[PDB]
């Protein structure tokens, strides 16, 4: 079967630079051009670049002027797409295209995130019901954390019916934020006391707050 | 240049799509079909040149799908018949052209056997405010705060589907905690496809 398998995630700082490689196994073909694009996290796609494995020949967009170089080894059938003078506009997901001419074959894609933050615990918002809210819904908003993951549970894990975790958003600051809501039934809210568990491993840090009104 | 597509669709199972690719004449060109499903990666589902004029497609979709290019001026479309849930993708179209491959926007197709249904949408505690969306099909919801005019520290989270069916969202504010009491903080939520816009005022 034809694969084109791409290289690992990476997150690196405003200014540096990442080289991404797409391998393709199963085509023992000296015809194996290979396309880039890269879709932002809320943008469609858009192209980078073209590379032909034999002859040589590549192509950049008006976009890229010096900061896309398509480089390609024939040996080891790998084709790397590197992308310099990075900033924070370029977080997206690479792709590599397939075959030649249609894009058959695709990689997995592999994200890329340029951000100048370090590392951050998260700094978790409980969210009460309001004045207008037979079933309440509860919240903990967990605001600036860099990089992912984190994880959010409700009760230790006991409660799990009702309770949606979103995806987490890059802001333009360079930081992470995610909500947890949950939507329990309204006359448990005195008696039934519920806890945002919050971990964030990469900072170590695992915050509980409660929620109530 | 610039490739316009279609506008979004919400089919139910077993219907049939056609999404075009209006263009900036695609003459010479040759355009790829791709789609993406929710989050994952992309698939091909066919190809087509003007000039060589062939035609080529995924043995996925080499019957359900068809490709064709408008008579007059220049146009191209993607229609694909027998609709599953599991067709529920954003469709591409990227045409080669003069050493440049210029993508499409995309179009969104939605397909389930799910009916239209309006979002019930408040939560309360610098504090941080926002509203959380609970099942409603389809997909586009739009939310703001106090008419447009809350744009800073408003967040609006990607939206999840549900065994139900159905999506949720949830949209949060983060404000100062002085101007609870004297700033009015309202959501809110457009729901086109159901016609209805909720107001849900927070405190």
């Known amino acids: 079967?034809?694969?084109?398998?791409?290289?690992?995630?990476?997150?690196?700082?405003?200014?540096?630079?990442?080289?991404?490689?797409?391998?393709?196994?199963?085509?023992?073909?000296?015809?194996?051009?290979?396309?880039?694009?890269?879709?932002?996290?809320?943008?469609?796609?858009?192209?980078?670049?073209?590379?032909?494995?034999?002859?040589?020949?590549?192509?950049?967009?008006?976009?890229?002027?010096?900061?896309?170089?398509?480089?390609?080894?024939?040996?080891?059938?790998?084709?790397?797409?590197?992308?310099?003078?990075?900033?924070?506009?370029?977080?997206?997901?690479?792709?590599?295209?397939?075959?030649?001419?249609?894009?058959?074959?695709?990689?997995?894609?592999?994200?890329?995130?340029?951000?100048?933050?370090?590392?951050?615990?998260?700094?978790?918002?409980?969210?009460?019901?309001?004045?207008?809210?037979?079933?309440?819904?509860?919240?903990?908003?967990?605001?600036?954390?860099?990089?992912?993951?984190?994880?959010?549970?409700?009760?230790?894990?006991?409660?799990?019916?009702?309770?949606?975790?979103?995806?987490?958003?890059?802001?333009?600051?360079?930081?992470?934020?995610?909500?947890?809501?949950?939507?329990?039934?309204?006359?448990?809210?005195?008696?039934?006391?519920?806890?945002?568990?919050?971990?964030?491993?990469?900072?170590?840090?695992?915050?509980?707050?409660?929620?109530?009104? | 240049v610039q490739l316009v597509q279609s506008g979004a669709e919400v089919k139910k199972p077993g219907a049939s799509v056609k999404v075009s690719c209006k263009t900036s004449?695609?003459?010479?060109?040759?355009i790829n079909w791709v789609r993406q499903a929710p989050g994952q990666g992309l698939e091909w589902i066919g190809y087509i040149y003007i000039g060589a004029g062939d035609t080529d497609y995924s043995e996925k979709f080499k019957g359900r799908a068809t490709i064709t290019s408008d008579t007059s001026a220049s146009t191209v479309y993607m229609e694909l018949s027998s609709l599953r849930s599991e067709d529920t993708a954003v469709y591409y179209c990227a045409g080669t052209g003069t050493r440049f491959v210029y993508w499409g926007q995309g179009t969104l197709v939605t397909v389930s056997s799910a009916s239209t249904k309006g979002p019930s949408v408040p939560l309360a505690p610098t504090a941080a405010l926002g509203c959380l969306v609970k099942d409603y099909f389809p997909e586009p919801v739009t939310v703001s705060w106090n008419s447009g005019a809350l744009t800073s520290g408003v967040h609006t989270f990607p939206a999840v589907l549900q065994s139900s069916g159905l999506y949720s969202l949830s949209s949060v504010v983060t404000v100062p905690s002085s101007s609870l009491g004297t700033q009015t903080y309202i959501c809110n939520v457009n729901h086109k496809p159901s016609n209805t816009k909720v107001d849900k005022k927070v405190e």
């Open positions: 004449t695609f003459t010479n060109y040759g």
